[PDB]
Specification:
NADP, binds nicotinamide-adenine-dinucleotide, 222 residues, 7-stranded mixed β-sheet, monomer, nucleotidyltransferase activity, nucleotide binding
Length: 222
């Protein structure tokens, strides 16, 4: 089965921890000329994104109405600009990654191979399926019907490692700037869980398919 490896249980703590440390070391080692230009504010913004920053940033990005945010809105906009700037200075990652999440059942029921999913927030992934799984275990209180999803993401563009600035974790994290587009290559719906193979695509290259907002579930105009 295409998702057998990720349906199976996890590798040992020792191995997962080692793989994450290896990925952190690789990430630091792959810092390039763009990295010399990373500012103090950029470094800090990214360092704290994984702990707390993502909660405000992603909320802002997914909000239907930010008119009410006041000073918080100016702050969130600044933070987002700062993290986006930093991300472009960090090393690219290409290969497979994973994302554990929740999705509206109403959206899941529409999805087919070839459809494109657009995430309005930043998109967090891990190179380690063990890490990704941890994020489909509980969700905040929610008024909609949500289902667990495990994404297997083929990354050929857009993903940058933040693991070289995440000293407190073993998360092997690869982050995407807002509005990342992912084309569905395979979907399996089994025993109340959903496994979705996706590939990164350039938004300007998407043609003659259906795009969906991954968070709201609403169609996104071609
Ligand atoms: N999700 C992953 O697999 C993953 C991978 C690497 C690191 N992380 C780490 O986890 C944190 C980021 O967590 P995240 O990726 O869940 O952040 P997120 O901002 O995407 O999601 C925040 C919360 O909302 C839920 N959510 C997201 N999209 C939803 C949707 N369409 N409908 C309903 N609920 C939805 C999430 O499951 C989570 O409970 C950071 O600390 C980051 O370092 C997560």
């Amino acid at each position: 089965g295409p998702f057998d490896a990720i349906k199976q249980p996890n590798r040992s703590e020792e191995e997962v921890t080692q793989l994450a440390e290896d990925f952190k070391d690789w990430s630091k080692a792959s810092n390039g000329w763009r990295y010399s230009f990373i500012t103090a504010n950029e470094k800090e913004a990214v360092e704290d994104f994984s702990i707390s920053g993502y909660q405000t940033a992603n909320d802002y990005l997914r909000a239907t109405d930010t008119s009410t945010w006041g000073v918080a809105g100016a702050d969130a906009r600044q933070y987002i600009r700062t993290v986006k700037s930093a991300l472009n200075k960090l090393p690219k990652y290409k290969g497979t990654a994973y994302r554990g999440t929740w999705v509206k059942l109403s959206l899941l029921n529409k999805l087919e191979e070839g459809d494109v999913l657009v995430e309005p927030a930043f998109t967090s992934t891990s190179t380690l399926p063990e890490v990704a799984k941890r994020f489909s275990v509980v969700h905040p209180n929610s008024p909609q019907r949500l289902k667990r999803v495990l994404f297997e993401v083929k990354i050929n563009q857009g993903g940058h490692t933040i693991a070289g600035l995440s000293e407190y974790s073993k998360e092997a994290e690869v982050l995407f700037a807002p509005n990342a587009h992912f084309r569905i290559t395979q979907i399996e719906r089994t025993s109340n869980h959903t496994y979705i193979g996706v590939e990164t695509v350039k938004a300007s290259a998407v043609k003659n398919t259906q795009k969906y907002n991954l968070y709201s579930g609403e169609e996104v105009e071609a």
